[PDB]
């Protein structure tokens, strides 16, 4: 599950709505630990 | 992250060269479909 917001809400270009800033609990090298990761995804790759 | 402003990805095709290219294509299409006709180019239909 990803928690995504619009990367920049101030864009007035054709790119508004593209590039979402998605956070998730990703696994790490050790099986017992988790890490919080923030990354950008294109709108076409992420579905609500 | 992205350094600096967010800009849309794009392609640039010269108008004069493309228009000449289509002119060549229309005459070659006319050789099979008939002269004194209208050849229309339009955007692709929907799908994937």
């Amino acid at each position, epitope marked *: 599950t990803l928690q995504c917001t619009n990367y*920049t809400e*101030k*864009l*007035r*270009s*054709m*790119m*508004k709505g593209e590039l979402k800033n998605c956070s998730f609990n990703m696994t790490t090298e050790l099986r017992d630990k988790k890490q919080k990761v923030y990354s950008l995804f294109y709108r076409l790759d992420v579905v609500q | 992250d*992205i*350094i*600096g*402003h*967010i*800009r*849309q990805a*794009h392609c640039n095709v010269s108008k004069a060269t493309w228009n000449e290219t289509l002119g060549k294509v229309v005459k070659q299409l006319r050789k099979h479909f008939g002269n004194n006709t209208i050849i229309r180019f339009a955007q692709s239909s929907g799908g994937d």
Partner: antibody
Amino acid sequence: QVQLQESGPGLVKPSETLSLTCAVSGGSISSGHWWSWVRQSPGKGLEWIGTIYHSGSANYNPSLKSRVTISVDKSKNQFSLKLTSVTAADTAVYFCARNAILIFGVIAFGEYYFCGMDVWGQGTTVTVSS
Amino acid sequence: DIVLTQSPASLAVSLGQRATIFCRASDTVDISGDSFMHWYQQKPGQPPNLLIYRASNLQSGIPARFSGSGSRADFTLTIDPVEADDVATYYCQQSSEDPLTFGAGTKLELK
């Protein structure tokens, strides 16, 4: 450089429409700049009314959207503002100004962020009275 | 709307003394690293004249004594030294989000 000169009624009866025309002299309205209107009035700091691109697309202040229309006349090199249903609260000095643009990219895709009103006119004082 | 709080309403210094005028936006005006904070000098009876663009860049034709600074919503503009010809009402302006908004205006006078 380019100078801006305004003209229109300085006295408008309440509830009619004010029409101000700003002439552009020395520059060209049909250029990569946005044209805008700003007002000043005692008790109120500068308040933005709206802005136009020579393509005809325009942005307006949300509280005035129902009453202010602006336009560009490419043959006259003039920028016009028509404000309907004027009230006593609308008394102000109205300035025409040129808003410089960063244009960091292809203008067809937006990619323009407004960056400074560098040229201002002298201001037309308008009082609403009758 | 983005609301700009300007402070002080009035500031006065003697000739040769530097002055700083503050502008506090209700929200961030930095878009992808560029601080869209503008600063104008409006002399009494005159239109405002843009002095500083993109928060810290000096406009061409404006004396070198003017400069700016700031990031996010907290901006500080300054005159160093203030001269006799600098008596004016100064305003901040934001272009981050429509509608464009202006500050209250600070009256700089000689003392």
